[PDB]
């Protein structure tokens, strides 16, 4: 957590100064640690996404409809 | 659960649980300290409030939203309303072994049949094929069979044609109002990707070939296909159970040719002569020697019986047109010529079918109607039948009439300026005079559209019905109404403000003269209200429909005779005008309460 | 005249002279965004308004503050195109200037303490194209102007919701741009009431006591005073004479020594007249006449200090005496007549519980913060900040001005906050209109409704972001050090950009542009809705807003709006419309002068026209003098009638003002009903651009306008001469007239080849020009996908008939030839997109290479070794594009296949397949590939192939560009070096380069030497700069996701042509489905042997009143009745002047049409190419209501040697006979739609399912399964069936054992059933057992 907090405090400054979002290599070498850990932190950080979110622009569809049970069986395979 | 991008989705319910736990055990921290009861109290409050949020969030008061700036789902919300489990996944179901597509017209059909694209039924009837392929020994097992399907050899198509035989189908138009929104058919198949479909049943669907599409299901097992072959098949369903009339009215082209064929003109040729039978009549029409509409004395055979169902051979002569003689050539042996010396508008053809049903029943009736459709299309084609600018008629007495109405309204304008009549008086006057003026114009034009044919033909001048297309459309009953044809030639009466309130100065022109901006501008809001309230009759319809059914979902017959005593009396409805419904016809189909008899008593 | 005019001319029949030319179509989007972003010194719109609003920003208490200065936009990184490619937004960044300002609050104002100027980045901002789109992630996206309730103050009244009462209930409302609301209203029982922000009803006077008013002040301002007088004996009074009007006398209302009106008697107008004339204002009366009045204010016997009377207290006679001895000769009192003067406020005061300011403030605080106790300063700051704080309340001064209008003020302006006087005035007007005086207003009158366009929304979310920031900066300022704290570090930039990006990309306004046809584009830009924020909702709506108001005329089209629920909400715009500086609409009108038509114009709003009178366009003006006849169709105040000539003020301009464009291009609309025309317009946008661009003959004249101003196609910005041409692109040169001096002076125009839409359709530009030919500015140079010669064209023109045919056109269906599909002339093209992905995983990265196990190696044949197909390859479902592979785990098994691998031995490796493939049933052809790859990661072999390929392609593009530039520049080096003496023939043969060093001359030749030296320096400068810059533009990696390593894209194509089941229609609502094709032979044919293309059913005409189409048909034929003739004259090949005379006679055919033509003007060559273009017909323009008439076409068909009727004589083809009577025939313009049989068909047998519920899913692309609702079951059990729906519910949806078992039964030739009990029922059981329920099941 505190690594993330540190990192974001840094990147704010980096996008002050560069007029841009920063590159992982740049703020990593400023943060004194290799790109792999940064990249994994970024892979890990974001939260879940609320099954009942309306992918439908209106209430025509929820997200929980358009997935599949890719675990169970198949009848032709049983035969 | 993840998706492919790696992100986990989360049922918001999880949140509702997790917070609960922590507070509980947080309380057990403070309880293990015997801290002041104040913190204890507010934590109890929080717990109660959280359970409330779990069980129904939008109920107690302050509604919880999550990160999304959106409220969360309690448990109840999976049970409430339309999104709940009942009418979303316990009654309104998704189904396997189905499909859908666009519809189109099969006119060469027999109405117990239907059109069908190949590949649809191919994949639908797939495991059937796998099984009998194993049975025949071409594909030893399933993988090989599936590959051969993907390979598409002629043996596959042959086997398809084998399996479709006897194997029925079932359709569904969207939406389903009355139970004849789905009928069982038999498959016949087309090198296309749309469905051909017999025309007459469109009215039972109310479907218009303007981009509609419909759905296909299949009776897998045995009893299913029995019920389909017995009950929802169209031949077993011709009369509405709401009212004992047919739903096999032939609509608008068939009837047109039938009218054109049976007609009492005189113009062409062959008048005043004789034949021995209808066959040489159609013969000589194909040779180009006499019209269909041409009146003639000929031979006729016919049959009857009030016997013990034993027909009464009969033969004589009749004055008649030719086309009526041809049209005799298909009636199945129980109906006289008296049916067919008319010009055959809609009500006739309906009555013909009703007669064939009462006197014979089902098979001969359907055979008859199918031949009706055939012959009607075929002879309407031979017509030549079109529309143009000159078929529309402008009565020359359309300008002066306007001028006198103009002068009248000017008169009463000066009168109300003097201040003698009132606003409502002026108003009533003006509306009455313009309405009568439109009546006068409609009179003129219909008197110059219907029977103006002065065709000298072994006479000097005889008046007969007009050969113009749109009047034949009108009197036939297929499409059109005197108001509408008035509205093509005459001016459009008057139209009102969207309040129900209404205008002073009416319209004064038609289409063929060409509207002007204001008149079109004014017709706008009328049309808008029309399609507007058309849009949403259906909400109320469906809603009260659910109410109706879920009252009466449960009842059923269980018994023949209750053994009880009398109930109701029924009497006619003769008040307000003449009779509107007989005692005779409403009691029809009912039973008798009691010993009754006739005013000649003891009968 | 122009050039493309001369290449082909369309005919007119419009006689009504024009005075206005059509404007640019979509100036409004441009102007809105322009004024938003653009600077403003004083006339605040845009950014500066928000900055000045929220800045400056002091510290938490005062020491430090920030001082806005100004801003700067910045150039973008990329261009438009690569942003379209890279899947990346287009935008420009933002910089701002800030200043720290600290002042020694230890001192009084020690300002010079420290200052730090610094600039700050915060936020990127997207941008508007020259057309009007934005772009995000490779998506042209559009937002739509909104339409809502203006601010200010409104009045209205309801028709006795206590229908018990059946009486009017007035009420009144205020509306700011921002903040809180109010609502004043009457109850049935004659009392005022008030509510903030739809809170509880409360009385009104509490607000006045809250505003530090006293009861005496209240009654002083509201009422007009009835004053008594005692003189020790008797009551006198002072009566305004017009106070008995509509009343009856109580006592003998009598003159000074004389009577006027007896008791119970009508006080006529003459009695009041005589009192007015007899100048009497002292009337002697009884004292008990007082009984009923109210005291104005408490008058006491001030000798005592005792309340003898409280204010608002019904008078008496004991108190009469009691104050008689007080010394008071009168106490002023009030008037009350229920007829004219409403005392409602006073009886309300009698129920006013409070007396003090403080209790009122308490109750307000209470209603708005229940449960909490009162504290003074809290409620006070609350009351004042709800209405008197500039931050929490704003009007957006359109409110202010119309507020001043509705109060009949002279003033215009002020603030976005309140006075008190405003409130008294509005209450006063309410009680007046409750007395009856004045009138209520309506909502639909456009003077009370306002647009809201892009820049405004943008300002809104921009400032709320600013507010998100200033909260923190308040937190940060006063706390830390105050000399070291830079201005910058107190800012975060995420919130502003967050709100802006989520608005431009997640609202319900940012919609994907529709690239069907240019019409779709521009009409989607010229939309208006009334949904979304500050707006409407269908359940909150009825019909009065759906419907039409008389004021739409000239501002909005009443036609063009769809058929679903969204009926009257959205509204496409009118044509010559403009909006107003305050944001209202207005429209052009010609003005009149003494019967003379003032040829200049004015834009008039929704209101002033209601004051004026107005004339129409049909008015046949009498040629520059006056108007012909006295009576003239005019309108005013909502309705129309016939008026004089001198009484008129204004007249309309053209006969198109009311409509939208889509409802304008339709010809002979006048002869058509409204609803079918609506349908035809909304049908005229789901179309497709055809393979070729076949033109429509007829038209209106508004085709090239939209063609141009859609910007889909190229056009010249400088006149000049061609220099090079190609299918891919052109090159132009400019003249000397438009010649900027410093430049080389050439334009250039590359093109857009085959390119996906958002709707998966082809897009292409091609020239319609040639070589060595001149140009003027504005001239088109190439044609988009649906254009020809800069005239719009969607569909094609086709031969028809009108008859039944064996049932194949039963209900409005269609029947066609095979001649068409073999001309491939409704054929169309459909691009499709695909994708694969390489990611990093738990184990290792997904790799990509050709070599994969368990592969049909023939499939590998198509690929390179990277695992990738080549270009131009044909493809089908099941085939492979890309070979992707995935690191594997380890696999658990069964004894059977275990034994099998004991037999054979061979295995899988420790990697599996994830290869992309063509979906089932789809086929096509590849034409493109693309790769996007990370930075720092190795670009593999094929990555380098496409990368050095695109480097070579673009270096070549710039080779061409820079070479022709520098070649134009080398025009110097001949005329300049051959100068300075001369060595011409001796110069020329030698190498070009060693000409600097020859015979050297006086000083300005050395000047020449230095100049050319700098020139050859600039040479390699240019080369270096451009080439290197874009080389390492291209060379880099990409900005993309986590987990990913690279991607691969594919853009392939398919050539789709016609089937049955496909939709088409025409321009009059004449829909049509296809029933079959037929061979040419079976079809009809005329006597001369020309068969016919399609056929259809004429019954649909009267029913639908889609008349004009048949009329169009007649005219259609006449076109080729000329056109055909010409080709004879073309190959007959007789002479120029013959056909010159001929077609000149053709254009001059009509009677009194306003265009003209003179062909002594032209050459012979112009004429010949014109005729070469017209040999297929003679296109026509029929305006909408200055249309042509049947007389003209009848004449024109006499000219074309053809029948007057259009009826002609036909033959069957299947049997050779003749039809018993003629038929109407001609050509009409038709077109197909975006509803394709393969884009609608789908079927299913078995596959995927859900997981929570385990029932098959829905969606064609998703392998849908069809739905079976609750009405179908009602139908079934009506038929008396049980087994069908039993098996339907159990197995084909939910039961698991049953579905599996029966699959394996029916494959074993057994049609048998074995149901279960569904899952969802048990789900319900678990869900209710969650709730404390002991539901269960009882055994039999």
Curated annotation (Swiss-Prot), chain A:
Belongs to the sigma-70 factor family. RpoD/SigA subfamily. It is found in: Cytoplasm. This is RNA polymerase sigma factor RpoD. Contains 4 domains, connected by flexible linkers. In the active conformation, the domains are in an extended conformation, each making extensive interactions with the RNA polymerase catalytic core. In the autoinhibited state, sigma-70 factor domain-1 packs closely together with sigma-70 factor domains-2 and -4, contrary to the extended conformation that is seen when the protein is part of the RNA polymerase holoenzyme. Signal peptide: none annotated. Interacts transiently with the RNA polymerase catalytic core formed by RpoA, RpoB, RpoC and RpoZ (2 alpha, 1 beta, 1 beta' and 1 omega subunit) to form the RNA polymerase holoenzyme that can initiate transcription. Identified in a complex containing RpoD, the RNA polymerase subunits RpoA, RpoB and RpoZ, CRP and DNA. Interacts with Rsd; this prevents interaction with the RNA polymerase catalytic core and with promoter DNA, and as a consequence, promotes transcription from promoters that require alternative sigma factors. The gene is rpoD. The chain holds residues 457 to 535 of 613 of the full protein. Residues 2-78 are annotated as: Sigma-70 factor domain-3. Sigma factors are initiation factors that promote the attachment of RNA polymerase to specific initiation sites and are then released. This sigma factor is the primary sigma factor during exponential growth. Preferentially transcribes genes associated with fast growth, such as ribosomal operons, other protein-synthesis related genes, rRNA- and tRNA-encoding genes and prfB.
From Swiss-Prot, chain B:
DNA-dependent RNA polymerase catalyzes the transcription of DNA into RNA using the four ribonucleoside triphosphates as substrates. The RNAP catalytic core consists of 2 alpha, 1 beta, 1 beta' and 1 omega subunit. When a sigma factor is associated with the core the holoenzyme is formed, which can initiate transcription. Belongs to the RNA polymerase beta' chain family. This is DNA-directed RNA polymerase subunit beta'. It comes from Escherichia coli O157:H7. Mg(2+) binds at residues 208, 210, 212. Zn(2+) 2 binds at residue 562.
UniProtKB/Swiss-Prot annotation, chain C:
It is an enzyme of class 2 (transferase). Keywords: Acetylation, DNA-directed RNA polymerase, Nucleotidyltransferase, Transcription, Transferase. One of its GO terms (cellular component) is DNA-directed RNA polymerase complex. GO terms for molecular function: DNA binding; DNA-directed RNA polymerase activity; ribonucleoside binding. It catalyses: RNA(n) + a ribonucleoside 5'-triphosphate = RNA(n+1) + diphosphate. GO terms for biological process: DNA-templated transcription. CDD domains: RNA_pol_B_RPB2 (cd00653). Coiled coil: none annotated. It comes from the Bacteria. Pfam families: RNA_pol_Rpb2_1, RNA_pol_Rpb2_2, RNA_pol_Rpb2_3, RNA_pol_Rpb2_45, RNA_pol_Rpb2_6, RNA_pol_Rpb2_7. DNA-dependent RNA polymerase catalyzes the transcription of DNA into RNA using the four ribonucleoside triphosphates as substrates. HAMAP family: RNApol_bact_RpoB. NCBIfam families: PRK00405.1, rpoB. Belongs to the RNA polymerase beta chain family. The RNAP catalytic core consists of 2 alpha, 1 beta, 1 beta' and 1 omega subunit. When a sigma factor is associated with the core the holoenzyme is formed, which can initiate transcription. This is DNA-directed RNA polymerase subunit beta.
